[PDB]
Ligand binder design. Structure first.
Ligand SMILES: CC(=O)N[C@@H](Cc1ccccc1Cl)C(=O)N1CC[C@@H]2C=C[C@H]3CC[C@@H](C(=O)N4CC[C@@H]5C=C[C@H]6CC[C@@H](C(=O)O)N6C(=O)[C@H]54)N3C(=O)[C@H]21
Length: 110
């Protein structure tokens, strides 16, 4: 019942609080295809990203109502979760814009 509403090419990262540095999500360096999925049954949204080369899922995160999405630069956006900060380092400004527009839309309708 999940349907993709966008896809963007980005390096998915998480902030390692213990070592005070960004690290590749899933320990897997390289680019992912990152979607927002809309579950129409319960009007929920999630971020799901899979490595482009090997298809491993490296991020699967809820988008709750009120999520604060920080566009730090034209190609790096980030948001908080209880466990860690997530980051998307986009391949292009246009990838970043298409993803942010889909995120904005999800946040407006939640
Ligand atoms: C008030 C508050 O806690 N605010 C949070 C942000 C926030 C605000 C509102 C809602 C949600 C969130 Cl999430 C916060 O300040 N956080 C999130 C944790 C992040 C960590 C470190 C420092 C290092 C300085 C900055 C940083 O990360 N920045 C600069 C752009 C820069 C661009 C790309 C990424 C790519 C990986 C790394 C690099 O290239 O080496 N890198 C970067 O180096 C990237 N920052 C942050 O950004 C920090």
């Amino acid at each position: 019942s999940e349907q993709s509403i966008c896809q963007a090419r980005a390096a998915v990262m998480v902030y390692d609080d213990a070592n005070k540095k960004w690290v590749p999500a899933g320990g897997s360096t390289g680019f992912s295809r990152v979607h927002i999925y809309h579950h129409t049954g319960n009007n929920t949204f999630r971020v799901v990203g899979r490595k482009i080369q090997d298809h491993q899922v490296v991020i699967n995160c809820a988008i709750p109502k009120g999520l604060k999405y920080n566009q730090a630069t034209q190609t790096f956006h980030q948001w908080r979760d209880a466990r860690q900060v997530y980051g998307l380092n986009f391949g292009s400004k246009e990838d970043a814009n298409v993803f942010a527009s889909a995120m904005m839309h999800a946040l407006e309708v939640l």
